[PDB]
């Protein structure tokens, strides 16, 4: 038994996508099928469902009037037509199936197809030093870093001192801002005694935009 | 907002202890609760249906109950493989809404609890020279992996311009998160200070920065 989703992609707000779900290994029972979505790092949300004979259909309030579910048992397929897409529709979309009579709801799940709704365009980051100070200093160690601001799409890579500095480096996962652009930070913890003697330079690579930045970080 | 099922964001249990995860909902006296387990990188799996029934393949240590407006998932003698996000699922009586709870991160403790290391950076001179300002609150090495972040301008709470990541697992099995507060240079220079407040396991640490520093 298998459910496999497809059709997810990157679109601008207001545009459309059609998701599909191919089912394999099921006999012809009365189990309803469903779409359930999950935004990155967030919870599950039921989106839409359809009865075995397509006679009964329902939608979450958040998608009513925009999404349309359909099902063709002859092709073992389930569909979700998504129109007038919004940024907040961005999520991994799962297809799921009930056991007969709905006794075990959402008993079977697919792997998900990713839908990204974004108005962002390719943009290289601005990089700013995060200077060490008495406030980022304790126990003989100081934290310093680089802020990698406002880029699209992912990913960026960060090294320090052209790869010569690796110990104590922590590059944080990016935040996705309301603008549709990403930002992240990379920090390194170093001996406080080294601040007057050792040069620290962060090297940021954003290949999608063909941008590279080197920024010296001074006390 | 819609019809809502309320779960604790995080529960932690030592191996062999009993974990309880609650789900409160006004329609639960008249509508069955269902529970799903979701491990990182995997699809959810049904673990309890119709308040208290266990599907085949689900260990007997999992049980469910529902009384009044509260459903509870109980895992008696928690095993490390039980670490997962758990979601309750139900409908209202009208059948207008099928909703999941917000989810509970269940940590089965595999190392000592650890408070976060927090560093707050002020806007750099370089960013101000680009007519921008961002405060950066970096949070690392915490366990279990659940945290909340709040900001203040002087002594007053601020929510506008705040962007915060969900916690992510580090290579050392502790967690990291970050929060950013975007301001205009004028806003930054007009306040005596700004603060980031990081709460973990009921403990809140506040870091502050000031433009005069």
């Amino acid at each position: 038994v298998q459910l496999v989703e497809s059709g997810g992609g990157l679109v601008q707000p207001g545009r459309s996508l059609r998701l599909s779900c191919a089912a394999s290994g099921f006999t012809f029972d009365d189990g309803a099928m469903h779409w359930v979505r999950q935004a990155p790092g967030k919870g599950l949300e039921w989106v839409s469902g359809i009865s075995w004979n397509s006679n009964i259909i329902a939608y979450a309030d958040s998608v009513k009037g925009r999404f349309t579910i359909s099902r063709d048992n002859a092709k073992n397929s389930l569909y979700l037509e998504m129109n007038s897409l919004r940024v907040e529709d961005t999520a991994l979309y799962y297809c799921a199936k009930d056991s007969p009579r709905g006794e075990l709801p959402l008993n079977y799940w697919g792997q998900g197809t990713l839908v990204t709704v974004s108005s962002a365009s390719t943009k290289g980051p601005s990089v700013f030093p995060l200077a060490p100070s008495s406030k980022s200093t304790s126990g003989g160690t100081a934290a310093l870093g680089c802020l990698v601001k406002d880029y699209f799409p992912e990913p960026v890579t960060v090294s320090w001192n052209s790869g010569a500095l690796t110990s104590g480096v922590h590059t944080f996962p990016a935040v996705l801002q309301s603008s549709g652009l990403y930002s992240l930070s990379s920090v390194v913890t170093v001996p406080s005694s080294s601040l007057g003697t050792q040069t620290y330079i962060c090297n940021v690579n954003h290949k999608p935009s063909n941008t590279k930045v080197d920024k010296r970080v001074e006390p | 907002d819609s019809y809502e099922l309320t779960q604790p964001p995080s529960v932690s249990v030592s191996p062999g202890q009993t974990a309880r995860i609650t789900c409160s909902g006004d329609a639960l006296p008249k509508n069955y609760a269902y529970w799903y387990q979701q491990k990182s990188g995997q699809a959810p799996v049904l673990v309890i249906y119709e308040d208290s029934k266990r599907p085949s393949g689900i260990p007997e240590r999992f049980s469910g109950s529902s009384s009044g407006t509260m459903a509870t998932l109980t895992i008696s003698g928690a095993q490390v493989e039980d670490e997962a996000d758990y979601y309750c699922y139900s409908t209202d009586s009208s059948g207008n809404h099928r909703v999941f709870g917000g989810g509970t991160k269940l940590t089965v403790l595999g190392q000592p609890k650890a408070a976060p290391s927090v560093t707050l950076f002020p806007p750099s001179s370089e960013e101000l020279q680009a007519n921008k300002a961002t405060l950066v609150c970096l949070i690392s090495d915490f366990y279990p992996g659940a945290v909340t972040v709040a900001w203040k301008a002087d002594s007053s709470p601020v929510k506008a311009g705040v962007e915060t990541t969900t916690p992510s697992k580090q290579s050392n099995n502790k967690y990291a998160a970050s929060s950013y507060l975007s301001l205009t240079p004028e806003q930054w220079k007009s306040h005596r200070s700004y603060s980031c407040q990081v709460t973990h396991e009921g403990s809140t640490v506040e870091k502050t920065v000031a433009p005069t520093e």
Binding site: A32, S51, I56, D98, G102 | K30, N31, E50, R98
Partner: peptide, 11 residues
Amino acid sequence: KKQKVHALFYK
């Protein structure tokens, strides 16, 4: 009893 979560799809 109580209502099952997907009851509407089996009416």
